[PDB]
Every structure is written in structure tokens, then in C-alpha cells.
Amino acid sequence: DHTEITTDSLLALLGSEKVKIIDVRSADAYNGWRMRGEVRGGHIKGAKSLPAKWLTDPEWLNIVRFKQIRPEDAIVLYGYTPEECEQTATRFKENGYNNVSVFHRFHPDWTGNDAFPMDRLEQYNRLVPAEWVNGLISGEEIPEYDNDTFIVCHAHYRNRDAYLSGHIPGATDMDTLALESPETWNRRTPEELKKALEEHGITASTTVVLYGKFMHPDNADEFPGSAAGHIGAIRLAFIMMYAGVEDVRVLNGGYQSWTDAGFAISKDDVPKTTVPEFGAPIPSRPEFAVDIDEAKEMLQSEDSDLVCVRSYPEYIGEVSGANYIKKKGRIPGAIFAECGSDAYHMENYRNHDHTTREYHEIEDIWAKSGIIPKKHLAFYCGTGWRGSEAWFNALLMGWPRVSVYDGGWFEWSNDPENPYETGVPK
Ligand SMILES: *SS[C@H]1NC=C(C[C@@H](C(=O)O)[N+](C)(C)C)N1
Ligand SMILES: [Br-]
Ligand SMILES: [Cl-]
Numbered sequence: 001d002h003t004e005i006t007t008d009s010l011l012a013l014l015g016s017e018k019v020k021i022i023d024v025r026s027a028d029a030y031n032g033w034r035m036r037g038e039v040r041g042g043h044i045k046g047a048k049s050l051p052a053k054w055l056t057d058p059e060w061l062n063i064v065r066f067k068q069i070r071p072e073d074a075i076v077l078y079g080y081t082p083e084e085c086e087q088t089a090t091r092f093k094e095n096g097y098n099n100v101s102v103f104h105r106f107h108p109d110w111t112g113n114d115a116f117p118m119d120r121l122e123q124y125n126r127l128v129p130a131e132w133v134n135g136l137i138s139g140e141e142i143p144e145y146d147n148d149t150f151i152v153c154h155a156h157y158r159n160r161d162a163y164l165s166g167h168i169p170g171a172t173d174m175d176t177l178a179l180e181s182p183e184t185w186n187r188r189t190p191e192e193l194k195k196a197l198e199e200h201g202i203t204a205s206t207t208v209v210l211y212g213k214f215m216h217p218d219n220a221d222e223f224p225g226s227a228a229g230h231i232g233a234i235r236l237a238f239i240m241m242y243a244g245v246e247d248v249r250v251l252n253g254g255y256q257s258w259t260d261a262g263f264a265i266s267k268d269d270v271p272k273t274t275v276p277e278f279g280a281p282i283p284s285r286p287e288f289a290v291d292i293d294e295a296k297e298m299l300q301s302e303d304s305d306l307v308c309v310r311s312y313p314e315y316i317g318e319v320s321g322a323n324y325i326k327k328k329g330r331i332p333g334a335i336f337a338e339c340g341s342d343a344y345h346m347e348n349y350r351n352h353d354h355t356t357r358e359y360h361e362i363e364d365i366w367a368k369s370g371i372i373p374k375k376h377l378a379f380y381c382g383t384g385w386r387g388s389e390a391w392f393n394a395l396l397m398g399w400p401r402v403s404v405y406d407g408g409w410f411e412w413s414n415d416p417e418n419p420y421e422t423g424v425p426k
């Protein structure tokens, strides 16, 4: 039996540092998706995201603490209904949080009056929920979509089994080698790009929906990237967006999210349906891609920064980060934005279910090191995969000048003329 907080008391508490307001709905609803047909979607201004879905995760309590939600705080929970909050509030009280309220009236009361402040992930419609994808493939009517032509694409890196072992019904598979070169690990040339997309059945006016499957990347193995399918997907989204595919979506949390929602999976080897003309000059969005000359410019410019999205061991030069990279070190002058544990994991940018981490946290961490939207930013990692994921996050926030420096450490370290640092920073 939980305390209730009224609409009015809550409104008067929105600036209080001791109150933590916690949205227990899915991360996609938090982000903006109007999952119940609500007119204004997103979250109560200043609310944190803690999906009720995550209650079955053993590390639940560490997530909460890592979100800086403390027993001294006044916790106010809300969902689509008060009932979805029941289990969360119990769980809080069971772990020593004695000040816990539930707000009953988020929808329709808070959402359906414009005096009540809400916030949302500005380009949330590019980061789609499973149910939207289901709607799309089922012929159903769905929000944030006014197109007649789509294609669901399962990304992988030389591992068709990641697709054949189970995929979204009707999706075709795209190897990441179709759009990037194994020589440079950079995007392919315009001509190749054109030909590969045509042959994958994609025009500039097609709504492409990208996802991949997480298969527990193991650093020991020859091709750990073959198991990091949803990073690969976001990488391909980058390239398609650069190319000039106007509407690219990424399924949030990958294949995982589709199955977690209990939707059916296929094992067919779906053949491609080619199209003859992409229908647009490639690349339409060249500003998304930055190359080494420009990268160098950006390093000696107040207006701009390179953002290093690698692991800490890579950063200090303990490991190269991959088995085809010989040199260990970092690019001098970049801003570190620690990806996670190694080159095939993105823990700092993701939740345990692989969905994007609460965007406010990404924002504030980035802000603490001067990664801010008024700069031209180029995100990079070893070859551009984690760079892409970081870039995509910034993009989702509406950041006006974000890029991927494609070459990354692999390109930079391949010229022995290029300077580099190593060891613990100074
Ligand atoms: S951004 S460093 C690394 N993270 C995952 C990749 C992809 C890479 C790999 O599988 O190691 N390939 C596909 C070889 C570019 N980059
Ligand atoms: Br992944
Ligand atoms: Cl680096």
C-alpha cells in the first residue's frame, strides 16, 4: 500500500534536487513514442527512465545506484497507469528506500494538458520500438510514417547465420562488408554504395529499418564483430544516412527487443528484390563523414572536437583494440568518451537489454568533458562502428553538426608520420 502524490504537489516539486521522478514505462515511450495514442508523448520534465521490464534483471539494484537514485531521495514513480508502478514501488521499499510515492495521473492528466512540462528525445522517431516495426510489416497504421515503401534489414559482419538462425519476418540480411571496405574499414565509394543498395533493394526514398543481433562478442575469437550485430546495424545506418537514404530507422535494442516483445521470428532465407535506380546522388549528406585531413583541422580548432569512443585499455594503450590493428595508443587532442569494456561492447551508451542509455545521462556525461552541441563533433573509435553508435545518439538529440571520423585509430595509426600518446593521461 503506497503513498499517492497529486498532480499539483508534483508540479511544485519539479525543481527539487531531493525528489527523483522515475518513469517506469518502456524506454521508447520515455523517448517520445506515443505508445497509448497520447497526444503529447515523452516524459515528465526531469524524470529518469527505469523501465518496469528491468525488474527481472539481477543487477536491478546496481542500475538504480548507478543512476544515483538514493534511499534519502523522495522517489516518485509514474507509468501509463498506477498499476505498472506497483512492482517497482515494492521493489524500492524492499531495498531500503522508505520515501516512495506513485503518481496516478500521468496519462491522461499530465500528458493532456500543456501547462504540465514534458520533455522528449528530439529525433525519437528515428529510434523505433518493436511494435512500430510489427505494425509496419503487418500493413497496419502507425505513427511517424507517411511512406509506401520500406525494407527491414538485418545487419551482420560475415555471419549470415546471425540472420538464418532467426530474424524479423520478411527482413533481408546485409553484411557490413556490402557497405564498408575490408582494406580501409571505411565506407565504400559512391559507385559501390549505389550498386550495393540497389542490389539490396533500397532506394533513397525507401524507409529502411536496421537492426542486428547481439551474440555475446568474445575478444578471443577471430571475428568478434560477427557477434556485435546491432552496433553493425547502427554503423550501416550511418553509412545509409550519409549515402542519402532519407528515412533510416534503427530498431532500439536490436533483435532482442523484437523477441522480448514476443513477436514471431522467421528462418527463411528471404531473397533480395532488386531495384534498378537508387534515385539520388551519393553522398547526399557528406557532412556526416569526416576524413583524416578534416579530422586534423578539427583538432586545432576551438569550433570543433574529435571524440574518442574506445575503451579505457585502448585509450591508455594497453591493447590495440582489435586483432588487425598493430599499434597501441591514442590520437592526441581528442576528447575521451569511454565506450565500454572493449571494442565489441557499448555498456556506457546502452542498457543491459541493448537499448540506448537514457539520453540525459549521455548528454550530461558528454557535457562534463565539453562535448556539447554548439561544436562540430566527429566521433570515432577503431574503425568507425562505435563511433557510429555515439554519433547516432547525438543525432537523436537533434545536435546540428555531428559526424563520424571514419578512419579512426586504424587509419591514423597506419601512417607512422602521425603522432600518438600512450599511458595513463596527463
Ligand atoms: S570501432 S573498433 C571495432 N568495433 C567493431 C568493429 C567492426 C570491425 C570488427 O569486426 O572488428 N570490422 C567489421 C572489421 C570493421 N570495429
Ligand atoms: Br551488438
Ligand atoms: Cl584514440
Ligand SMILES: [Mg+2]
Pocket: 184, 185, 186, 187, 382, 383, 384, 405, 406, 407, 408
Ligand atoms: Mg572506418
Ligand SMILES: [Zn+2]
Pocket: 043, 044, 045, 046, 047, 119, 120, 360
Ligand atoms: Zn528529459
